């Protein structure tokens, strides 16, 4: 069965740093391109960024650009986002995702509703106190 | 509320693993060591259909394997005799988008479905000779994947909106309906018995339903993409499944889990049609890479390989009494193989 | 010197029950109709609820409408907002703003980026944990 | 960062308020007991000037307390003669919202300024008799407010933007820029020796700049609203303050606070327009219903009450020598004021 988990999130100061942990098993790491998803309270689903098979493309959004750092361990079989910098705005429930198909550049349903190939997610909240 | 339900349906997939490696006495290739290889086959295109405009989708073979069907995205339904090559029937379909079609076991109904989401049946028994639309079912939100006949008034139908629908011709609304996949529903396979069907779905799984009670039986978790193709052994009490991660894998209901795995290195393309012979002993799966190969189900050897499609072959029929076999690609082409000696 | 000083909120469960205190000085409460403003993280001001001189009048946005309960107390000259059934959406911070004039219905630019009425306000998160 | 600057911020106004709290010896109304009351004052309109189309918004006097100019919303500037009510002069103004409008101390030019946030200045020594726009001043982004005249050659103005500017009419460049204020300033005062001038703006303040350095002095916050009107006491040493709140205010420079403030129970309405007399004694502060009262200085009293106008009283000004006040509302009249024996 294809299961992937989420670890790491919580509460953290603005301007702080935080990592977030996606363990899959299931299939095979290495083959398939992994995307990660976040999604605002009372906002829909927006791609966050990827990373290809072996890492040698990343790619980013505006929001987030020089802000993450996305890297994958095939040998570990895990997925990290590693977050500094961060802002209130930033506040969201996070998914890891895998692109439905093997030995492909395109993902085409990774950002929707019903997408079946990602995990639960965590929380994570940019909130001073 | 949810923490509670989901960790007790945590613990109940635990004990279905627990019970599914219990049950794990050997393993089939294990046991099929001692039994003499099936050895290379060689398949002669015998006879090409051509014709249709647009890429083939589906096909289905008939009771007496001597009339097949085929659906074009054009918006053509072409009946074909395989014996002659003569066409019998050119049916202009409503819709041009045709994903399937299916061929009713009395030949007297022909059955379409596509994007538009209506299942379009279409009767042979007119006197006057003009095919016409006898009914059309109008149900199903997410786009038309498949259908089976069952009988001259019962239909089994697969849609994307993960439901699967048992609709009565005379009266024209769902009899049963089918809800327990995550994903879209691509295909099914009728039991011989006319008694169970299981269906392959884009959540990696398939479910065994049960046409009288319409409650899910088993459900069977072992492809890691999409499942695109199903079929069931000859005897019925096991099933084939292709999907796109080049693998297709074998399923036994009474063991409840996978007896066996077919995979290639060399192989990394997607799985279109997969169908197994008479005797069940080959397994012909068509595969993305332009070509179909034909599988041993018992030693996973390649026993032979069919390439003669210009494009993926779309669809994959075998005969009720295994004469031939006729594979639809979208090259607009259709080529029947059979054996020679 | 007219100054509004806000209390109450923090990290609050969703579906719990909160109160919000604004306490204004340097200027007489009874003749000065009352106003609550929140902005959500990246977003801009929207107005919550208003309660009139003598709170026989009182008013709600749609989001808040059977939600949240506005009173006012002339004699401790102190305003109130008592808020339950919260969301996740409902993270914002909160000022207390005055109506500019007095004896007076209407209020321009409460909802104004440089008012010069409103108190520094106070942080709500409504993030489970 | 933020927190170790405001709990300073804090504890300096918490020292300011201790300092003025020291030095509070008495109360003004306390000393002036022993004082004569003003008494009943009784004002004729003695010159009604009529002719603009619009509102007036505001009006200044002549240093030879002889000609007037007056600006309307319907972009007409008209200079009167306030003995014969002939009009000397009648400015077609290329914006129509006009604000504010000053007269230069020499009265060879009149500025003028209002939404288009351009201070429009005309000169009147031409000898062909046409009036024409002298210099253009654009540097100010928020609404303009108020003007007055330094001398020939440097105004001062105010903006709606919380700034106020000090511009060269030969250079027709700010040369100091004032940026001290949290809200809109509506109006400004000189001194009478023009080294210092008084600022009230939307934020329930007063400030204190020096023309020289630039530089904020004192701040005075003892207003409950938006201060509408202000105006230096006739020494120089103190100034009237009027707000929405239905309240005038009496702040000293030297004692850096407010002495006595002028408010009545059945008023609850807005004040437009304040001004000191001659000797400083009255205080003529135009309110927003439909009328003007003249308070005592020193005991807070209404000495008379000014109903001759069918709107609230825009304006209020007073001569140099004090023989006559005019007053402008919204009806497009002008009342000019005089006492009588």
């Known amino acids: 069965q294809v299961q992937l988990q989420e670890s790491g999130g919580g509460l953290v100061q603005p301007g702080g740093s935080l990592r977030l942990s996606c363990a899959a098993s299931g299939f095979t790491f290495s083959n398939y391109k992994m995307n990660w998803v976040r999604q605002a309270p009372g906002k829909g689903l927006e791609w966050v960024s990827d990373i290809s098979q072996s890492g040698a493309s990343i790619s980013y959004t505006g929001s987030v650009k020089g802000r993450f750092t996305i890297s994958r361990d095939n040998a570990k079989n895990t997925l990290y986002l590693q977050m500094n910098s961060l802002k209130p705005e930033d506040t969201a429930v996070?998914?890891?995702?895998?692109?439905?198909?093997?030995?492909?550049?395109?993902?085409?349903?990774?950002?929707?509703?019903?997408?079946?190939?990602?995990?639960?997610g965590t929380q994570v909240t940019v909130s001073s106190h | 509320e949810l923490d509670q339900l989901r960790q007790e349906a945590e613990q109940l997939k635990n004990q279905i693993r627990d019970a599914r490696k219990a049950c794990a006495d050997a393993t089939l290739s294990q046991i099929t060591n001692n039994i003499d290889p099936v050895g290379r086959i060689q398949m002669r295109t015998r006879r090409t259909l051509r014709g249709h405009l647009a890429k083939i989708y589906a096909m289905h073979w008939g009771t007496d394997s001597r009339l097949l069907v085929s659906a074009s995205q054009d918006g053509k339904l072409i009946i074909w005799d395989s014996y002659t090559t003569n066409k019998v029937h050119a049916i202009p379909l409503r819709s041009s988008w045709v994903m399937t079609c299916a061929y009713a076991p009395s030949g007297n109904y022909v059955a379409c479905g596509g994007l538009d989401n209506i299942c379009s049946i279409y009767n042979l028994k007119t006197r006057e000779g003009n095919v016409r639309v006898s009914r059309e079912l109008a149900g199903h939100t997410g786009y038309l994947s498949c259908c089976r006949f069952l009988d001259d008034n019962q239909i089994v139908t697969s849609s994307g909106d993960t439901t699967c629908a048992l609709w009565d011709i005379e009266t024209g609304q769902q009899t049963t309906t089918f809800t327990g996949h995550t994903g879209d529903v691509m295909s099914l396979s009728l039991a011989p018995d006319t008694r169970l069907f299981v269906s392959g779905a884009c959540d990696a799984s398939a479910k065994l339903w049960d046409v009288r009670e319409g409650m899910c039986r088993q459900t069977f978790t072992g492809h890691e993409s999409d499942i695109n193709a199903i079929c069931f052994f000859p005897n019925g009490n096991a099933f084939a499944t292709g999907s796109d991660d080049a693998t297709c894998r074998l399923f036994d209901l009474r063991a409840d889990q996978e007896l066996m795995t077919y995979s290639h290195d060399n192989i990394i393309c997607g799985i279109t049609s997969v169908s197994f012979s008479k005797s069940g002993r080959l397994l012909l799966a068509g595969y993305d890479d332009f070509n179909c190969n034909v599988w041993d189900a018992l030693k996973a050897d390649r026993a032979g390989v069919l390439a003669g499609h210009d494009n993926r072959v779309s669809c994959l029929g075998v005969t009720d009494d295994g004469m031939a076999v006729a594979t639809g690609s979208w090259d607009s082409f259709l080529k029947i193989w059979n054996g020679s000696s | 010197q007219v100054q509004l000083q806000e209390s109450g909120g923090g990290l609050v469960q969703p579906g719990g029950s909160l109160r919000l205190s604004c306490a204004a000085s340097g200027f007489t409460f009874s003749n000065y109709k009352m106003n609550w403003v929140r902005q959500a993280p990246g977003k801009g001001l929207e107005w919550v609820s208003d309660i009139s001189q003598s709170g026989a009048s009182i008013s709600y946005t749609g989001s808040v409408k059977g939600r949240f309960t506005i009173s006012r107390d002339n004699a401790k000259n102190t305003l109130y907002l008592q808020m339950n059934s919260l969301k996740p959406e409902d993270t914002a911070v909160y000022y207390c703003?005055?109506?500019?004039?007095?004896?007076?219905?209407?209020?321009?630019?409460?909802?104004?980026?440089?008012?010069?009425?409103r108190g520094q306000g106070t942080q709500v998160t409504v993030s489970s944990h | 960062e933020l927190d170790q600057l405001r709990q300073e911020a804090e504890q300096l106004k918490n020292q300011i308020r201790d300092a003025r709290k020291a030095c509070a010896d008495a109360t003004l109304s306390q000393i002036t007991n022993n004082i004569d009351p003003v008494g009943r004052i009784q004002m004729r309109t003695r010159r009604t000037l009529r002719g603009h189309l619009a509102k007036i918004y505001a009006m200044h006097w002549g240093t030879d307390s002889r000609l007037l100019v007056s600006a309307s919303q319907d972009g007409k500037l008209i200079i009167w003669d306030s003995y014969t009510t002939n009009k000397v002069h009648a400015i077609p103004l290329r914006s129509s919202w006009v604000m504010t409008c000053a007269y230069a101390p020499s009265g060879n030019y009149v500025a003028c300024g209002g939404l288009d946030n351009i201070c429009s200045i005309y000169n009147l020594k031409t000898r062909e008799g046409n009036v024409r726009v002298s210099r253009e001043l654009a540097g100010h982004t928020g609404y303009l407010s108020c003007c007055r005249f330094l001398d020939d050659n440097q105004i001062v103005t105010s903006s709606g933007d919380t700034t106020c500017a000090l511009w060269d009419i030969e250079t027709g460049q700010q040369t100091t820029t004032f940026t001290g204020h949290t809200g809109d300033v509506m109006s400004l005062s000189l001194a009478p020796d023009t080294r210092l001038f008084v600022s009230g703006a939307c934020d329930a303040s007063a400030k204190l700049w020096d023309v020289r350095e630039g530089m904020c002095r004192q701040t005075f916050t003892g207003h409950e609203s938006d201060i509408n009107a202000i105006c230096f006491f006739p020494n120089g040493n103190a100034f009237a303050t009027g707000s929405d709140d239905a309240t005038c205010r009496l702040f000293d420079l030297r004692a850096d606070q407010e002495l006595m403030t002028y408010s009545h129970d059945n008023i609850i309405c807005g004040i437009t327009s304040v001004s000191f007399s001659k000797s400083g004694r009255l205080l003529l502060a135009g309110y927003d219903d439909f009328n003007c009262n003249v308070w005592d200085a020193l005991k807070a009293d209404r000495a008379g009450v000014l109903a001759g106008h069918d709107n609230r009283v825009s304006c209020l000004g007073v001569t140099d020598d004090g023989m006559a006040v005019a007053t402008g509302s919204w009806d497009s009249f002008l009342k000019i004021w005089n006492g009588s024996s």
């Open positions: 703003a005055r109506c500019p004039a007095p004896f007076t219905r209407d209020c321009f630019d409460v909802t104004s980026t440089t008012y010069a009425y």
